[PDB]
Every structure is written in C-alpha cells, then in structure tokens.
Amino acid sequence: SIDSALNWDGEMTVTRFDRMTGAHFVIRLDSTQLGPAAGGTRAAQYSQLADALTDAGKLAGAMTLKMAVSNLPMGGGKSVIALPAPRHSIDPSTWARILRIHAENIDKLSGNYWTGPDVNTNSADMDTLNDTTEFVFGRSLERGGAGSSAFTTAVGVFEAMKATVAHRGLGSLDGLTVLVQGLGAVGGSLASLAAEAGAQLLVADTDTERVAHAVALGHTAVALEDVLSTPCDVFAPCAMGGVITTEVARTLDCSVVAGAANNVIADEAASDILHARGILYAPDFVANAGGAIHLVGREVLGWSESVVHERAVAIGDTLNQVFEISDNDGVTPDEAARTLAGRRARE
C-alpha cells in the first residue's frame, strides 16, 4: 500500500531504475541499531512499484526483529529487485547487468548494509555480486562464503515445529499430519525431517516434478487450490508470504502453524484469529532464523558448522520462552515474540 510504500518509518530507502533492463532496485534498511543492516536480495516481478516498496519494507522489519530475537549483532535490512520479466526469462547478460548495478548500490552504503541470497538469488549470484562489492554474505564455499543456509534454516524450523507441537499438547510429530506448502530448498529439507520423525506428509508445490518426486518418496500430493482448505495437524508454509489473511485464519483446518516463509501473516487481526481459534502459530521470525544464524554465525562470528547447527536448534527454546510469555501475559505469540526480541535487544 501507499502507507507501507511512502510512509515507511525505517531508517533509509534506496531506489534506482535502469532503463537498459527496465528493472527497479529497492534497498530498505529498517534498523542499524544493533549493527549494520543485513538481509537477502529478493528478485521477482511485482504488479506495481508500491508492491515492491511494501515488500522490501515488511521484510526489512522481519530482519530487524529476527536478528534481535536470535541474539545476532546486526540490524535489519532488505533488497528487492523488481524484474521486468520472470526471473527464468531474464537472459544471462541482463541478469548480470542487473546484478552489477545492485552491487554498485550496496557499495555506496559502505558496510551499512550486507546482503545475501533470498528468493531467486543464489550463492553463484553472490559470488557475482562480490566482484563489485564486499558487503555480501552467502558466497559459495570456494569464494570464501558460508554457502547455502537452507539446511540450517530447515533444521531451525523443524525444531521450532517440534516445540510448537509439544506445547499445543499433541505430543510428538509421530502420527501427525503435516502439510508442507512449497517444496523448495528448505521446504523439501523440512519434509525429510518430519517424515523421518513419524509424521505423515501432505505436499504442494507449483512444481510438478517436485511434487512427483515427493510422491515417489511416499508422500501425498495436494492440489495448490486445496491447500488452505486441507485438514492437517500442522501447516508448514515454506513458499511465499502473506499467506494468512483474515479469511484464511478463520478457515484453516489445523492445530499448529510452523514454516519457513517470511511474513506469513497478512494482517494483525488474522494473528488474533488463529489464536482465538486454538491454533498455535510459531512466529516466522523466530522459527525461520536458522539461515541468519548460519550466515552471520559463520561469516561474521566465525562459528563452526556444529555450533551454527546447535544454535539453530536452540530456536526451539526461544519459542518455548515465547510460548511462556504469550501464555503468561495473554498475548498472541507474535506479540509475545516481539516482546522477547525487545528484551534481548535490551530495549
């Protein structure tokens, strides 16, 4: 929206347009209070510019809280690339140009912002980015990066998922029905984990091959259009965000909500509804923090692979504290989560 686009209260907004490629660049820094901002680089096609600005803004926020509640020394920031065409259609030469300019933009910030991979960006691109700028996390192992953080991400979400399931009074994942939306990098990892832990897997993905294979493995396919209406014990949104609107909140058929996506909840009211409906949601910003722990832990703090792994598992604990507060003070988890980040940031 316009509010969310023009009247954003973050510390800085950076924009740029390239006539050559017709692409627009957005870099939103929400907070640099606890450290330089850091956030991925999402590249995607938006209906309107304002949608691009909105997204960069909501994500940047999530980043800020995510870093604070996870005890990372950094601020929240985010970069959005409004593509002129679908990522897959972009030609190599353009992709590269676009990447080049983006990198130029980061370099201007001079360490006030550090990027990494997000939707449609990868370790190879980071490497590419790194040819112009230094403010990059997630470059491939060969270039000196910590590489991909999906796994750390998925591990975090699994631990989180387990913590949520226990709290809700469902016992263990054993014999529970888990619905995974989005079988990507993280999504697909998380399914392996849950399956292995005794859960029945219901899966959905825009990608048929993805789906086909999960089916191969003994999973159950869900038509994209039956997703939000499909009964489960747990709902794992691991695809795009803004998935839970006020209307979805009142109709979802589950007891738990735990996934990897950023910004799952569209409106504040939705979050109240789930709550009111006896649906235990684990805050996205807590749950999906394994990727940040990984990049920051490794690249910034120099943590080994194990520590990072162990810190990501500790995500479950954070949740337990979140759950304790929400339960004590009578707030939603979301709020409860917001409360603990604030306390950890020592605000």
Ligand X SMILES: NC(=O)c1ccc[n+]([C@@H]2O[C@H](COP(=O)([O-])OP(=O)(O)OC[C@H]3O[C@@H](n4cnc5c(N)ncnc54)[C@H](O)[C@@H]3O)[C@@H](O)[C@H]2O)c1
Question: Which H or E run contains 216?
Answer: helix 208-216
Kindly state the DSSP code that residue 84 receives in the 8-state scheme.
S
256 or 286: whose CB is closer to ligand HCI? 286
Kindly state the DSSP code that residue 140 receives in the 8-state scheme.
-
**Which 185-214 residues touch K ion, going by CB under 5 A?**
none
Q: Pattern 242-271, binding to ligand X, x per CB under 6 A? A: ------------------xxx---------
* Residue in 116, 259, 283, 297 binding ligand HCI, rule: CB under 6 A: 116
Question: Is 182 within any annotated ligand binding site?
Answer: yes
- When asked if residue 90 is in the footprint of ligand X (CB under 6 A), the reply is no
| CA 240 – CA 33 distance, rounded (Å) | 28
Region near ligand HCI per CB under 6 A, out of 33-41, 139-147, 307-315, 326-334: 33-41
Shortest distance, position 115 Cβ to ligand HCI, whole Å: 6
From the list ligand HCI, a second copy, K ion, none, pick the one residue 245 interacts with, judged by a Cβ distance below 5 to 8 Å according to partner type: none
- When asked if residue 144 is in the footprint of K ion (CB under 5 A), the reply is no
| CA 66 – CA 123 distance, rounded (Å) | 22
Bridge partners, 37 (sequence order):
75, 113
Kindly state the DSSP code that residue 101 receives in the 8-state scheme.
H
- Identify the sign of the CA torsion 44, 261, 222, 195: positive
* Residue in 38, 59, 103, 109 binding a second copy, rule: CB under 8 A: 109
Rounded to the nearest 5°, which phi and psi values hold at 53? Answer: -60, -40
- When asked if residue 174 is in the footprint of a second copy (CB under 8 A), the reply is no
- When asked if residue 39 is in the footprint of ligand HCI (CB under 6 A), the reply is yes
| CA 88 – CA 5 distance, rounded (Å) | 27
17 or 229: whose CB is closer to a second copy? 17
**321-337 burial, b if ≥16 CB within 10 A, otherwise e?**
bbbebbeeeebbbbbbb
* Residue in 35, 184, 283, 333 binding ligand X, rule: CB under 6 A: 184
- When asked if residue 15 is in the footprint of a second copy (CB under 8 A), the reply is yes
- When asked if residue 240 is in the footprint of ligand X (CB under 6 A), the reply is yes
Active site (annotated) includes residue 78? yes
Q: How far apart are the first and last CA of the chain?
A: 29
| CA 107 – CA 33 distance, rounded (Å) | 20
Q: Which amino acid is located at 315 in the chain?
A: I
Contact 105, 27 (CB under 8 A): yes
CB atoms closer than 10 angstroms to residue 188: 19
104 or 310: whose CB is closer to a second copy? 104
- When asked if residue 61 is in the footprint of ligand HCI (CB under 6 A), the reply is no
Question: Is 210 within any annotated ligand binding site?
Answer: yes
Nearest to 154 by CA among 58, 264, 236, 75: 236
| CA 256 – CA 233 distance, rounded (Å) | 6
The residues that touch K ion, with contacts defined as CB under 5 A, are: 171-172, 174-176
Summarize as ranges the residues that interact with ligand HCI (CB under 6 A). Answer: 38-40, 66, 115-116, 118, 137, 149, 262, 288, 291-292, 295
Catalytic residues: 78
Known binding-site residues equal 42, 66, 117-118, 149, 153, 182-188, 205-206, 210, 239-240, 260-262
Query: Residues interacting with ligand X, by CB under 6 A?
Result: 118-119, 149-150, 153, 181-187, 204-207, 210, 224, 238-241, 260-262, 288, 291
Residues at the binding site for NAD(+) are 42, 118, 149, 153, 182-188, 205-206, 210, 239-240, 260-262
